[PDB]
Amino acid sequence: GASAQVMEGSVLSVIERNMNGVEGLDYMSTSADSSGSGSVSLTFTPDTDENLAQVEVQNKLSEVLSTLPATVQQYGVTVSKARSNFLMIVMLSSDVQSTE
Amino acid sequence: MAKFFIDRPIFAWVISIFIIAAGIFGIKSLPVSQYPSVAAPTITLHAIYPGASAQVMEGSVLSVIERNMNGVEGLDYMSTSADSSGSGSVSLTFTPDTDENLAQVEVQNKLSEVLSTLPATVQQYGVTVSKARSNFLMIVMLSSDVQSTEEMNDYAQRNVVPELQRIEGVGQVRLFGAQRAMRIWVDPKKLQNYNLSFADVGSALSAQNIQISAGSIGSLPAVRGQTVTATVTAQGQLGTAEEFGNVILRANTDGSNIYLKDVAKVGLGMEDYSSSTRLNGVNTTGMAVMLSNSGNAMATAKAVKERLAVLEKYFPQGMSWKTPYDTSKFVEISIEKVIHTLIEAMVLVFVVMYLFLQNIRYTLIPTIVVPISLLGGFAFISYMGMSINVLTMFAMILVIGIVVDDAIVVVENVERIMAGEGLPPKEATKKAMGQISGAVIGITAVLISVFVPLAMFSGAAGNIYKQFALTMASSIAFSAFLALTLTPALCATMLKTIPKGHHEEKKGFFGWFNKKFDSWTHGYEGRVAKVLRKTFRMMVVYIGLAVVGVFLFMRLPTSFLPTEDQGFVMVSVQLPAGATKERTDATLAQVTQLAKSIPEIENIITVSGFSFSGSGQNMAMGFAILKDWNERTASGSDAVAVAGKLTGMMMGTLKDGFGIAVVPPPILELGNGSGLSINLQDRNNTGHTALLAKRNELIQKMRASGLFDPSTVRAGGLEDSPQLKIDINRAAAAAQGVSFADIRTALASALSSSYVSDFPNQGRLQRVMVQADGDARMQPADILNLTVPNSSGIAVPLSSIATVSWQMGTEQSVRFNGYPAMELSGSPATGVSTGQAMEAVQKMVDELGSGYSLEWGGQSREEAKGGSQTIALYALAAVAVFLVLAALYESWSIPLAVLLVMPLGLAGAAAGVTGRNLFEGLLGSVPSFANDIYFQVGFVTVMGLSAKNAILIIEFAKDLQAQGKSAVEAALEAARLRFRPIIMTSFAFILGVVPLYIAGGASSASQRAIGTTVFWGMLIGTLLSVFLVPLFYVVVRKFFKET
Amino acid sequence: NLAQVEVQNKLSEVLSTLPATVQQYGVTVSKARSNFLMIVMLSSDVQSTEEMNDYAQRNVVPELQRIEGVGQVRLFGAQRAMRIWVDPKKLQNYNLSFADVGSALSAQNIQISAGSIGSLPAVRGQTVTATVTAQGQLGTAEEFGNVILR
Amino acid sequence: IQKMRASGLFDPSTVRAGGLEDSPQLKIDINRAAAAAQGVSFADIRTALA
Amino acid sequence: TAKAVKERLAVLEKYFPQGMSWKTPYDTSKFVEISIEKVIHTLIEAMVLV
Amino acid sequence: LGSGYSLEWGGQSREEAKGGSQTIALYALAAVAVFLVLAALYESWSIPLA
Ligand SMILES: CC[C@H]1OC(=O)[C@H](C)[C@@H](O[C@H]2C[C@@](C)(OC)[C@@H](O)[C@H](C)O2)[C@H](C)[C@@H](O[C@@H]2O[C@H](C)C[C@H](N(C)C)[C@H]2O)[C@](C)(O)C[C@@H](C)C(=O)[C@H](C)[C@@H](O)[C@]1(C)O
Ligand SMILES: CCCCCCCCCCCCCCCCCCCC(=O)O[C@H](COC(=O)CCCCCCCCCCCCCC)COP(=O)(O)OCCN
């Protein structure tokens, strides 16, 4: 139940502003959509570890989680240190049952 | 190596170029801060529970959170603090060898599994989990005098805070003040008139103000033939006060709906209303900047100032920004002092070399070799992950005197060989290298073995010693490598052959100086020959001097860091129990009027509602910032004199309450003067009165029947205060139609506040609170008029249900390791060991019944450990030095003679410190020198220099005895040969340390503390060694006839 | 450490989809061995095993589970609590049920937070401030025995 | 995007925006005065829209 | 860990109520320490035999 | 376009920008390394120049 500007101005912008100062942070990118969702991607720099970066991001996010709206805290903010390009695509085919 | 690099100067030059490049790369790639991280990982929670006492908050939130924080890897101890302000704190101090990020994530995970068992309001406000470590950089104060403090806070949070935390190097920006919210002051008289309640207001605010989520028209699981889909929007929240004032509280059939503006008043206000900051009397908004790791302090401060100017170019009319305090100028002053010291040392070395060698091409070698050693040390400290701070700069300043002596001795030996044998520079350099290579290697090994144990201590003191150790040892190693690699090449290429007998036909001032120096050398040789004749009396005199030095060292006060004039003094004001904030504001105004009456104070910052001792309406604190050191060069102008004057003016002016001014010492983890802290814990949970009685009994035992300086033994917590407890009678309530939730609702609606809903105020969400019209809740006779509703109506005046009375309740609750604890702060007077005092305190606590324990807190936890690691480390270092000297000299007796010069420097340093203390005392001043870390560093430096000189003398005396000379003749020749380089190096070191002896200004305590020690130690050590080293050699040669 | 961090992250995402009782009791994550290193006894002849279990949970278990190397301390028992054994033969007489008992216990044993007389946002001329306290809670057996069901 | 096309360096049919193609939406403006004068609480509208 | 637990128990025994005691009839560190001592004795015997 | 509208890169393009000032630095570093190595090995300032 939020706009593309309310989600940023109330949830994403706060995390983006409080996520500065992390060691190895190269840049950030915030993207909110009209479906009531937002994504803050932090792209780190070389000479940086992945687990330490995730731990520092979680520490910075938890100390600022007391300011976000109540419904966001109910749903929670999920962390994903995963890639975005596809390696394989498995396809299941059948003629005796539907796709559901 | 000495002969390999003498025929290949280009290879040595390439190695030096690589070292310089690595040093420059490390210097450009090092963090910059005023002090390193010497504390341990600490995690804090800071829960919020408004409108509650200390016991309720503690037993409801803090105990529940503390009983689950058991099992975290690396937990040292934990403490719990609660007050009457409505806040709590659970501080977990972690054992070393622990990462603070892992500790914080573990604490958050442990709190996540117990958060659902806390009260509803605690979950609404939330529980934070942060780390106590902070790298403070600057303070940005915004003062308008034309706008409210809440307006300035909102402006800073909306246009200033997000602009400062985006700068390179900034790690955190913290605002001091409550945010903005929508406050509704509800008059209870209107509610009782319209027959309403606070629950009705809460329901109306939570129902009329809610976010609506509609969805999409033409959603995906649609019917065949859909071509358009659109998101549906619906606004169901309020954002202005007029909209909140139209909230319907009750709708009737005929109409006449009761709005929120008919029984209450809505408006924008603050969320806490507690703290208030003022700068010189005007309203101010506080913003604290914390420096980030792997960042710079000077560049970050400059960028912050530039951004602040660019923002003030858009500020409204009346606002103004200031930066009264900044910890980035201390490292600036330290770097400029290091550069000035390096330049002065180079000038002194040039002067002494031109005076003693009578040529100009001898002075270029030290000037070329010293900066390379400094760059190598910088590169090493950059490789080890260290940073540039005051301690590293002081270590670099202290190591300048040692890195030049290698080049000095090399050039002196080369020049002596060239003037004696008349050989060209190549052969003379080869001979000098073949003579002194093993000696240089042994000296380097001894210095490394002496400086290694400094980096093996535990605690904050160990972290402080590690900087000096890793800097000085690296600088010494690089200087040794340069003296073995580049110095011989420069001496062989940059020098020219001296004609036969060229010195004598020379005349003028140089001839007179040569004549005088030769006469002094002959006199010194005669005196040494006289000393080598009466060996028994000289040895007994040496033993007497050593025992006197040991006695003078053992009779010195012990400390960690001398108090430094940081440029500001803190002031804590406390009022009687039950005082409101108006009296505290009046006292703060009086304190400001008194502080601006002192010409040494530039800006005064007063904070009302917060103090380090406690947080309450009667507590207050302020920070009087002083002017620059250049404008405070007088007697009664330092921080201590200003603090004394402020205290004297407060004790004669402050009628209500008392205020004490203290100058903040160096790093608070290594804080001296606190004495000895104890925490008395109740094991069986007997109560508060029993624990207070036991605390009073322990205080009486330590004061009268003890030795803990009765002028210091006192409680350090907070005495009880009058309260207004309400004892409800369940029998009387059961006899009527009143339930027990009715009393709870009435008490929650009467005094305390409530957090009901949220609202968007121009982009950001803010809270909506109800304070119940504070005009009513002013007198104690207001709760006794609260009529609590019965089953049908409300007729009970609450005097038949409960009885109100006055009692003495605690205003602060403290727990230590899961037990109720009370803190005490004693102090030994003087000449009494802290170990025996701690044993006496432990025995006294054991005298009480089984169920009352004691535990140390702060620095006492480290003092509880026996001081055996230092003695063991020093013994191991001495054994390593003996082994290295035995491997060098190839004997078991010569190291015994070399090790006899250690007590000389110690006695000299102790005598110098005692003399300076006496001079300060007789002239009215107080003794400012003790046995601190700087004294130990200076003593280690002077003992290393004395060991180097003794090693050189003993090597020259031993290699001259294998040619057919006796011990006395060999010692005399070695002394006559080593007289000149020792004198030159001593003069250079003393003239370079003199600027640190009378240092006055920024960071002058540590400067003088190291300068006096090193100066007197070097002077006495040289004066004693030049006559006692040959004596020790002769004694060891005659006592242990070799194999 | 990282494995436990990711496990906590995965558990926090499905913790709200569990029953109310599981959230009341909570889910405990641990990393320790399944075998025992030692067994500590608390033999006595004056107190029963319930008092000894309570004392061990209050003073012995927390002191032992904070030692370096300890992964878990399982007490063969449980701490003290207030047990209410209801007779269903008597609930039918007064037409009562377990829901009434639970509601009475939750409504008559709730902590009260009063506040402060003379709070900070006050009138000009306020000199005295006092914290108001009310117990509103039961901690004794005969106090719980007097809970009003009707 | 317009000046990137027809410039020789970028080929057409590839220069595209990465936006979400801002769309028309339905806006529902609630009148609290009418809902109060007719006897409709603000929670009923929220339940109906949800 | 066993040594630390035993030391903590010996320290906490001073606060126990009158009547109760403590003991660890099941402990695995004793076997380890006795095995280490036996192996050290065997090493000393081998040294003297050589 | 004017001021205020800056430009940022995404994906490999940023890396391509990083390849704008690193090539000259790499070439200079290789040249100076060869010079220093030759001067240290052959003991001359003229051989590496040639
Ligand atoms: C170099 C270490 C510095 O420590 C801090 O700055 C920390 C960050 C604050 O304490 C910390 C202490 C801490 C950690 O306590 C738990 C924290 O929670 C609070 C906010 O202040 C300080 C003293 C600020 O106090 C706070 O100023 C705010 C404008 C209002 C706030 N008040 C409403 C409460 C008050 O406390 C204040 C005034 O900037 C101090 C300025 C004036 C100084 O000159 C002093 C010398 C500081 O440079 C400092 C002590 O050297
Ligand atoms: C009569 C005889 C006279 C003989 C000679 C007289 C006195 C000569 C005095 C010479 C002074 C030399 C000054 C050196 C300039 C220091 C520049 C430091 C640059 C830097 O950051 O570090 C370098 C680049 O690293 C990177 O990879 C960063 C990438 C960007 C670097 C941009 C620099 C381009 C090339 C500049 C030349 C570099 C100097 C040559 C090394 C690598 O240094 P390092 O840490 O690798 O050191 C090797 C450790 N084993």
Residue numbers in the entry:
A (entry chain C): 51 to 150
B (entry chain B): 1 to 1043
C (entry chain A): 101 to 250
D (entry chain C): 699 to 748
E (entry chain A): 300 to 349
F (entry chain C): 848 to 897
Article sentences:
MtrD works in conjunction with the MtrC periplasmic membrane fusion protein and MtrE outer membrane channel to actively export antimicrobials out of bacterial cells. The cryo-EM structure of MtrDCR103 revealed that this multidrug efflux pump adopts the overall fold of hydrophobe-amphiphile efflux (HAE)-RND-type proteins and forms a homotrimer.
To elucidate how MtrDCR103 recognizes macrolide antibiotics in solution, we incubated a 2-μM MtrDCR103-nanodisc sample with 10 μM Ery for 2 hours to form the MtrDCR103-Ery complex. We determined a cryo-EM structure of this complex to a resolution of 2.72 Å. The overall structure of MtrDCR103-Ery is almost identical to that of Amp bound (labeled as MtrDCR103-Amp), with the three protomers displaying the access, binding, and extrusion forms. In the binding protomer of MtrDCR103, the cryo-EM images depict that an additional large density corresponding to the bound Ery drug was found at the distal multidrug binding site. It is somewhat surprisingly that the observed large Ery molecule is anchored within this deep pocket. The binding of Ery is extensive; within 4.5 Å of this bound drug, there are seven aromatic, two hydrophobic, two polar, and one positively charged residues that provide aromatic stacking and hydrophobic and electrostatic interactions to facilitate Ery binding. These important binding residues are F136, I139, R174, F176, S275, T277, Y325, F568, V607, F610, F612, and F623. The MtrDCR103 periplasmic binding cleft is able to accommodate Ery and forms additional electrostatic and hydrophobic contacts with R174, Y325, F568, and F623. Likewise, the cryo-EM structure of the MtrDCR103-Ery complex depicts that there are 23 PE lipids that are similarly oriented as the lipids in the Amp-bound structure.
